[PDB]
Structure 1
Amino acid sequence: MSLNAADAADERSRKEMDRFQVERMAGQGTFGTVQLGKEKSTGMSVAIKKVIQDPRFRNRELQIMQDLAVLHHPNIVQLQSYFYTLGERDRRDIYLNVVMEYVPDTLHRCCRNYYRRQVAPPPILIKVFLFQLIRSIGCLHLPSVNVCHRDIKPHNVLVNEADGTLKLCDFGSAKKLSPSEPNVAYICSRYYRAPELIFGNQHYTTSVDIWSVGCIFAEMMLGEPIFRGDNSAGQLHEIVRVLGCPSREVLRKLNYNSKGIPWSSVFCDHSLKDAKEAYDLLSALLQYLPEDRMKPYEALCHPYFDELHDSATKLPNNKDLPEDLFRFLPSEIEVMSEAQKAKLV
């Protein structure tokens, strides 16, 4: 199961590779490949990702992963190792490999497993997942971290359904934004792209990641992406078809006249006991104007999450909620408002 020393691109890389055994392929695709392995020293399960870097774009996977590894946040993957390997199909290619703790599934597959059985995922799972996903972007967006992920989607939100845990991963597109500096607008997967990105703004803020998270909340409750456009213009049309056309002043700030569709009509879920609360939260995430979207630490205090504070609340398999849900890092606690601290800590 040892990694092949001959594939190492250099001595540092051979030494890092000797730390890990490979067990099996977990998944593969345009991003490259992810193997399940094990750290030999600890027995710990790791995900070994061979990174394919598109040279039309700046890839910051390694540098952001190294910045975030200082924090050890419970809802962000933690870098264990990085090394370079020679290509298998052509040994002149060299690839970055990043090693992090293994998470068994993607949010995409976990949700698709329910919908392929004609049922929405259990409401308590959608809720603990959303809580942890909002926590991950709260941490990213702290003034001391200031990372905009820019590509949050159900394929890079990882989950362990059995314990209700969630981790954000895939920082190749992430960047520290500045109101004074420009960025590529064609970033993000189309269905998750915020209105300000659709309009081609080169200056934007971390609120783009709040929009993506709102999109994902809706997707967990619907079974498909909520805003499925065929292109930049189609994307804006699908958003307005669902949300309602925004005022002319809103559209001029970002740069048909739809009434929009009530959430109750979109999701067709009359069993969800706290739907009014869920849909209030979703509307607060999906504000057209970035400055109007509910900020993560405040969203964590939203009444939708109240039952996550009760010890009697269990996951669908009768397991306790994750122990780290309300374990916040000092860098988070120290910038909370008194009300957020009272509620969450």
Structure 2
Amino acid sequence: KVTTVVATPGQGPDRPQEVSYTDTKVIGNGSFGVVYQAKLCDSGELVAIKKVLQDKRFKNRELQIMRKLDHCNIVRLRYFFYSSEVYLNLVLDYVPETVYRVARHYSRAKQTLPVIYVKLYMYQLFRSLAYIHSFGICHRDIKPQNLLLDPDTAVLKLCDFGSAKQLVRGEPNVSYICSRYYRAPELIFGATDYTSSIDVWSAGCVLAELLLGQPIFPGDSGVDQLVEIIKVLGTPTREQIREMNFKFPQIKAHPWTKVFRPRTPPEAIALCSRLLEYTPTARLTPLEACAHSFFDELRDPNVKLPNGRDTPALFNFTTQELSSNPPLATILIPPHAR
């Protein structure tokens, strides 16, 4: 029936409120715990409730990160509450689809996702990355399942901050983060001195996958994944290996244009090659990726969604979001942007 709790709003001062919800059903089970869907009684708005066991010795890192985030391309923490050992419940605004589910529909129908959606989704993913990276926060698990979508508005929201953390130069970090297909080669080599550019490699794998209709670097083991990477980028040099972290197969770099289908836009291929680089510092930053020419169509004042509606918010950048390179506001914010 109706469940009533005293929950603290995600943003603003700590002042708990009585919150009632109903139609509670399980929508996911993972190593962390369970994710439910529920409907708020007052507004009828749908929410996802991520229930995790509370450590007791320390504050939950995912909650601390979520309370600092406020961005149109990041899933909104509406409330949080504790319940029966103690459990933390993160109440997030529900988003009905994911890039994983949508890409699977196109792949099963032997069709590719239209390039207009590839531009819209990748651009919004790079904006969410620019925002979290501006605080030193690395997501560490960028993959299609963590890219929520509203199919009507074409809004994308990054979710699952269970692996996210602030990367401080000089501090070591666990290499065993990030999921199969999307792991940067420095993580496959077990590097503990990686930077936020691991999220950019993962985003590049998502872009290549949306263009190909299948993952670009598949394999259930790191050896297989690394052989697939070497087939595309060629054997990494001794310098490139040192920048990431043995006798590798001497394979020449496959021309990036031949990796994708003939109809693939060349700007999409150019963007891929600048994200999927062995040297972590050579990869584009998320803000530079947003300013790439592959996204120029999104900055045209006449562009509209295939369903006739206007594009979602794309140019409401804040000072925080542009901090890594403020002069890019000239490309990123077009003349017509309000």
TM-score when normalising by structure 2? 0.87
Does the CA-based 8 Å contact 2:7-2:80 persist in structure 1?
Answer: no
1:103 aligns with 2:101: no
Does the CA-based 8 Å contact 2:96-2:149 persist in structure 1?
Answer: yes
Task: For 2:78 and 2:258, locate their aligned partners in 1 and report how far apart those are by CA, in whole Å.
Answer: 45
Give the Å deviation of 1:140. Answer: 0.8
2:150 corresponding residue in structure 1: 160
1:51 corresponding residue in structure 2: 52
Per-residue deviation, residues 259-286 of structure 1 (Å, max 9, x unmatched): 2433443332x334xx111100011011
Does the CA-based 8 Å contact 2:107-2:214 persist in structure 1?
Answer: no
2:11 corresponding residue in structure 1: none
2:285 corresponding residue in structure 1: 295
2:314 corresponding residue in structure 1: 325
SS in 2 for 1:84: strand
2:240 corresponding residue in structure 1: 250
CA RMSD of aligned residues (A): 2.5
Task: For 2:286 and 2:270, locate their aligned partners in 1 and report how far apart those are by CA, in whole Å.
Answer: 15
Give the Å deviation of 1:53. Answer: 8.0
1:337 aligns with 2:329: no
Does the CA-based 8 Å contact 1:244-1:260 persist in structure 2?
Answer: yes
Does the CA-based 8 Å contact 2:127-2:286 persist in structure 1?
Answer: yes
Task: For 1:134 and 1:344, locate their aligned partners in 2 and report how far apart those are by CA, in whole Å.
Answer: 12
Give matches, 1:211-230, under 5 Å: 211-230=201-220
Give the Å deviation of 1:315. Answer: 1.9
CA distance 1:95–1:310, change in 2 (3 Å): same
Give the Å deviation of 1:332. Answer: 2.1
Query: 23-32 or 307-316, which moves further after superposition?
Result: 23-32
Give the Å deviation of 1:37. Answer: 2.5
Task: For 2:68 and 2:303, locate their aligned partners in 1 and report how far apart those are by CA, in whole Å.
Answer: 35
Q: Which has the higher strand share?
A: 2
Give the Å deviation of 1:252. Answer: 2.8
Task: For 1:192 and 1:59, locate their aligned partners in 2 and report how far apart those are by CA, in whole Å.
Answer: 26
2:71 corresponding residue in structure 1: 73
1:34 aligns with 2:32: no
Per-residue deviation, residues 13-69 of structure 1 (Å, max 9, x unmatched): 9x97951413353721325433333334444332222236899xx96221211122x
SS in 1 for 2:287: helix
Task: For 1:333 and 1:22, locate their aligned partners in 2 and report how far apart those are by CA, in whole Å.
Answer: 40
Task: For 1:73 and 1:133, locate their aligned partners in 2 and report how far apart those are by CA, in whole Å.
Answer: 11
Give the Å deviation of 1:228. Answer: 1.2
1:259 aligns with 2:272: no
Task: For 1:12 and 1:228, locate their aligned partners in 2 and report how far apart those are by CA, in whole Å.
Answer: 42
Poorly superposed stretches of 4+, deviation over 6 Å:
52-55
Identity rate, percent: 47
SS in 1 for 2:137: coil
Task: For 1:279 and 1:111, locate their aligned partners in 2 and report how far apart those are by CA, in whole Å.
Answer: 19
1:63 corresponding residue in structure 2: 64
1:171 aligns with 2:161: yes
Per-residue deviation, residues 81-102 of structure 1 (Å, max 9, x unmatched): 112333xxxxxx6432101111
Give the Å deviation of 1:334. Answer: 5.2
2:12 corresponding residue in structure 1: none
CA distance 1:53–1:169, change in 2 (3 Å): farther
SS in 1 for 2:177: coil
Residue identity matched to 2:329: K
CA distance 1:336–1:42, change in 2 (3 Å): farther
Structure 1 residue runs of 5 or longer lacking an equivalent are: 87-92
Query: 191-200 or 128-137, which moves further after superposition?
Result: 191-200
Does the CA-based 8 Å contact 1:137-1:296 persist in structure 2?
Answer: yes
